[PDB]
Amino acid sequence: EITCQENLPFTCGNTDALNSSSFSSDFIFGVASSAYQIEGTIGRGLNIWDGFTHRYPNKSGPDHGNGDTTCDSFSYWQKDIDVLDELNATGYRFSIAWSRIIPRGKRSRGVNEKGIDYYHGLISGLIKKGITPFVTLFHWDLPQTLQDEYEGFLDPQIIDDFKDYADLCFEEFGDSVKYWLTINQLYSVPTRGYGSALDAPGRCSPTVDPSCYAGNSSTEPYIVAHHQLLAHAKVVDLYRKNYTHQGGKIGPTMITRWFLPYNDTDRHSIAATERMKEFFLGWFMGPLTNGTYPQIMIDTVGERLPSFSPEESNLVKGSYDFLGLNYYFTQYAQPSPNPVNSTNHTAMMDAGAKLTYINASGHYIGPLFEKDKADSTDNIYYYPKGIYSVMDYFKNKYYNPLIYVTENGISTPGDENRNQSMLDYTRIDYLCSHLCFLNKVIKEKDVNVKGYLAWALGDNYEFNKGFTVRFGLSYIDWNNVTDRDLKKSGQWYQSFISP
Ligand SMILES: *[C@@H]1O[C@H](CO)[C@@H](O[C@@H]2O[C@H](CO)[C@@H](O[C@@H]3O[C@H](CO[C@H]4O[C@H](CO)[C@@H](O)[C@H](O)[C@@H]4O)[C@@H](O)[C@H](O[C@H]4O[C@H](CO)[C@@H](O)[C@H](O)[C@@H]4O)[C@@H]3O[C@@H]3OC[C@@H](O)[C@H](O)[C@H]3O)[C@H](O)[C@H]2NC(C)=O)[C@H](O[C@@H]2O[C@@H](C)[C@@H](O)[C@@H](O)[C@@H]2O)[C@H]1NC(C)=O
Ligand SMILES: *[C@@H]1O[C@H](CO)[C@@H](O[C@@H]2O[C@H](CO)[C@@H](O[C@@H]3O[C@H](CO)[C@@H](O)[C@H](O)[C@@H]3O[C@@H]3OC[C@@H](O)[C@H](O)[C@H]3O)[C@H](O)[C@H]2NC(C)=O)[C@H](O[C@@H]2O[C@@H](C)[C@@H](O)[C@@H](O)[C@@H]2O)[C@H]1NC(C)=O
Ligand SMILES: *[C@@H]1O[C@H](CO)[C@@H](O[C@@H]2O[C@H](CO)[C@@H](O)[C@H](O)[C@H]2NC(C)=O)[C@H](O)[C@H]1NC(C)=O
Ligand SMILES: *[C@@H]1O[C@H](CO)[C@@H](O[C@@H]2O[C@H](CO)[C@@H](O)[C@H](O)[C@H]2NC(C)=O)[C@H](O)[C@H]1NC(C)=O
Ligand SMILES: O=S(=O)(O)O/N=C(/Cc1ccccc1)S[C@@H]1C[C@H](CO)[C@@H](O)[C@H](O)[C@H]1O
Ligand SMILES: CC(=O)N[C@@H]1[C@@H](O)[C@H](O)[C@@H](CO)O[C@H]1O
Ligand SMILES: *[C@@H]1O[C@H](CO)[C@@H](O)[C@H](O)[C@H]1NC(C)=O
Ligand SMILES: *[C@@H]1O[C@H](CO)[C@@H](O)[C@H](O)[C@H]1NC(C)=O
Numbered sequence: 257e258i259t260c261q262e263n264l265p266f267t268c269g270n271t272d273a274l275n276s277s278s279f280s281s282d283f284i285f286g287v288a289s290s291a292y293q294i295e296g297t298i299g300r301g302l303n304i305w306d307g308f309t310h311r312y313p314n315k316s317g318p319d320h321g322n323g324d325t326t327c328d329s330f331s332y333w334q335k336d337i338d339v340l341d342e343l344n345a346t347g348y349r350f351s352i353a354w355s356r357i358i359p360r361g362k363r364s365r366g367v368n369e370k371g372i373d374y375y376h377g378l379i380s381g382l383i384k385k386g387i388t389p390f391v392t393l394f395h396w397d398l399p400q401t402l403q404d405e406y407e408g409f410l411d412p413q414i415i416d417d418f419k420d421y422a423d424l425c426f427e428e429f430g431d432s433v434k435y436w437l438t439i440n441q442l443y444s445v446p447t448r449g450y451g452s453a454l455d456a457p458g459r460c461s462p463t464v465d466p467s468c469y470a471g472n473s474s475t476e477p478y479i480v481a482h483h484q485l486l487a488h489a490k491v492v493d494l495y496r497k498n499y500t501h502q503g504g505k506i507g508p509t510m511i512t513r514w515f516l517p518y519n520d521t522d523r524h525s526i527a528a529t530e531r532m533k534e535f536f537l538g539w540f541m542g543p544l545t546n547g548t549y550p551q552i553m554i555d556t557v558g559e560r561l562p563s564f565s566p567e568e569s570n571l572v573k574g575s576y577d578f579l580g581l582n583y584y585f586t587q588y589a590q591p592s593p594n595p596v597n598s599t600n601h602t603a604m605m606d607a608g609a610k611l612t613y614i615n616a617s618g619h620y621i622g623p624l625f626e627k628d629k630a631d632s633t634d635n636i637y638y639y640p641k642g643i644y645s646v647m648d649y650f651k652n653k654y655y656n657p658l659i660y661v662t663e664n665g666i667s668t669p670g671d672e673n674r675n676q677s678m679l680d681y682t683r684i685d686y687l688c689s690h691l692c693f694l695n696k697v698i699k700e701k702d703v704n705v706k707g708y709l710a711w712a713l714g715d716n717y718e719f720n721k722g723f724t725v726r727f728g729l730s731y732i733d734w735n736n737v738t739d740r741d742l743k744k745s746g747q748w749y750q751s752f753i754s755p
């Protein structure tokens with residue numbers, strides 16, 4: 257019988273108690289990263305994250321930091337492989353920058369051979385060290401030209417352009433890459449990029465944020481989500497029909513969260529909690545497992561929710577060999593009004609729920625995850641059991657899928673000096689507490705999880721936060737980004753992997 261801790265202090269950092277041997281022999285352990293966050297603009301075209309961070313510096317981060325140079329993995333990709341080698345990692349998730357291999361967006365306009373070579377070298381180097389690549393085709397960095405031509409994912413033209421880009425990737429790298437991720441965190445771009453405008457492209461309704469250049473927070477998130485599903489499905493169909501000879505697997509990446517009732521004895525809070533599961537997870541998992549959106553969304557969103565044609569529904573349903581599940585935290589849910597007529601209405605309000613990290617009785621869900629200096633009441637707290645609950649939910653609600661945890665990590669303040677940043681015991685606690693519960697859910701619920709990739713191989717540009725927070729298991733000096741030194745967490749993970 258496995259027992260896991262939910263509150264501080266944690267003792268899972270002791271590799272004698274918890275290590276890789278606790279998992280199945282073939283279980284993959286590694287770290288993850290994304291192109292915009294680690295490469296730099298050198299050698300590639302411009303994408304919407306370059307556009308967004310430059311047009312709206314205040315939105316790029318409190319420090320106005322962006323991905324211009326960041327950790328310079330373009331030049332130091334070998335250093336990334338060295339970190340993985342040091343960790344004895346068996347997996348590494350990275351993304352291909354669409355702007356690096358097809359700077360002009362549309363494949364017919366030509367490809368960047370040097371960009372293709374960049375990834376060939378990285379992939380070859382990973383395989384030579386016994387590291388299995390998990391490659392994300394689209395980690396939000398859409399070529400700026402496509403956003404300017406037809407507003408990217410807001411238009412159906414994105415489907416064919418994304419398909420042509422994915423085809424190039426399968427053609428060029430598919431002989432070595434056997435695990436593909438289509439779109440990173442399906443829920444994110446529609447809501448943050450077209451709803452709240454916290455992320456690129458930065459579209460929203462005029463009254464939601466006057467800085468948005470255009471948009472409609474009430475309708476656009478649904479249009480974008482719909483196109484993401486169609487684009488994703490078209491790519492999976494292409495992969496399974498034209499690249500089955502490569503013997504690989506492909507799937508979408510879902511940002512997952514668990515939800516608990518703000519008040520567990522209040523039917524309204526309980527209902528809000530179930531609505532959240534449908535609006536947050538079901539929005540994409542419904543189409544992916546059934547070819548239709550959840551009924552609660554159909555009823556609530558009405559005319560603003562696009563419909564799938566029979567052909568599209570068939571294309572989207574079952575469009576995955578596995579699911580890349582990102583998990584960070586859990587929230588309490590309570591009812592909230594949905595003012596559809598208000599000029600400031602957003603798609604996110606449709607769930608009819610308010611989210612918090614503190615319940616009705618004043619209980620904080622778990623240890624501190626992220627401290628918000630602007631407002632103490634806006635701090636994020638984590639919940640280790642959430643990963644158990646999410647995995648259990650996916651197995652029982654979504655037809656026992658093959659799962660790879662594609663992201664799981666925690667940040668530490670950017671204000672900390674080198675020594676403080678290196679002594680990241682809070683990261684060891686976060687990672688081990690989640691790994692404990694992951695091992696527990698695999699054994700108790702028989703969830704088909706076959707890999708775990710911790711977020712951020714090293715410190716990089718963090719979307720919306722610039723360099724004010726660090727997520728890496730390896731430290732990076734911004735005055736000399738060459739080195740990738742394992743922090744205490746990286747050293748612990750090394751021991752966890754090879755006890
Ligand atoms: C997994 O996918 C399944 C489909 O492959 C889902 O089942 C479908 O669920 C649909 C509801 O979402 C359901 O469609 C409704 O059918 C009503 C009856 O239509 C028949 O009878 C009519 C007699 O007058 C006739 O005119 C029709 O031609 C049909 O013969 C219909 O009245 C409904 O329309 C109203 O409600 C919808 C909102 O749901 C409005 O959009 C619409 O304007 C109207 O107000 C509705 O029809 C749909 O209307 C919209 C239109 O775009 C669609 O084409 C049209 O179908 C449908 O019958 C079933 N299909 C099957 C095979 O059962 C399943 O949903 C779950 O299970 C169903 C039974 C139901 O309980 C849902 O609430 C559940 O979510 C999906 N499962 C999951 C997990 O999501
Ligand atoms: C988690 O949710 C539950 C269920 O909603 C909360 O319990 C409910 O708390 C209500 C008070 O906010 C209770 O209603 C009140 O009852 C007294 C006594 O009769 C009455 O004088 C009040 O006017 C009020 O009555 C309601 O008024 C509005 C009407 O629409 C409604 O029909 C009336 O009932 C309610 O009885 C109670 N439900 C039950 C079954 O216990 C719960 O609130 C916490 O516990 C209750 C018992 C009370 O001590 C609250 O002060 C306390 O916050 C809530 N838990 C938390 C931590 O918020
Ligand atoms: C976002 O787009 C929606 C849909 O075009 C707008 O909602 C429409 O608003 C008009 C004017 O009040 C109504 O006549 C329609 O019935 C609404 N459509 C539906 C079914 O919601 C909404 O106003 C737009 N929001 C902004 C701020 O531009
Ligand atoms: C807020 O969360 C706390 C912690 O989960 C809940 O307290 C637990 O409630 C159960 C059921 O009554 C008790 O058996 C446990 O002993 C409590 N644990 C603790 C640490 O107190 C509390 O019920 C939640 N509040 C609401 C309204 O949902
Ligand atoms: O559900 S969302 O659409 O908000 O996306 N969820 C994310 C999870 C999350 C939210 C807030 C803080 C930390 C993590 S978005 C989150 C943004 C992080 C900062 O750039 C980034 O490091 C991480 O890879 C990414 O998943
Ligand atoms: C208050 C503040 O400092 N933030 C402003 C914001 O109000 C403004 O809409 C935006 C224009 O792009 O520029 C930001 O710097
Ligand atoms: C790994 O953890 C297990 C408990 O799950 C323990 O029995 C074993 O001794 C540990 N391995 C090492 C080498 O410490
Ligand atoms: C790396 O892991 C393999 C497989 O568990 C093990 O045999 C090997 O000794 C490890 N190498 C190091 C130096 O940790």
Ligand SMILES: *[C@@H]1O[C@H](CO)[C@@H](O)[C@H](O)[C@H]1NC(C)=O
Nearest residue numbers: 419490493494495496497498
């Ligand atoms: C597979 O490739 C062929 C040759 O380019 C193409 O004709 C066919 O449409 C492709 N199948 C798809 C789009 O899945």
Ligand SMILES: *[C@@H]1O[C@H](CO)[C@@H](O)[C@H](O)[C@H]1NC(C)=O
Nearest residue numbers: 463464595598599600601605
């Ligand atoms: C506009 O939206 C904001 C954010 O949800 C909300 O706080 C405010 O009350 C709304 N104003 C109106 C029109 O009620």
Ligand SMILES: *[C@@H]1O[C@H](CO)[C@@H](O)[C@H](O)[C@H]1NC(C)=O
Nearest residue numbers: 733734735736737738739740
């Ligand atoms: C930058 O760091 C590298 C690796 O530690 C080192 O070799 C080089 O001398 C440093 N350059 C500077 C800033 O002096």
Ligand SMILES: [Zn+2]
Nearest residue numbers: 306310322324
């Ligand atoms: Zn710049």
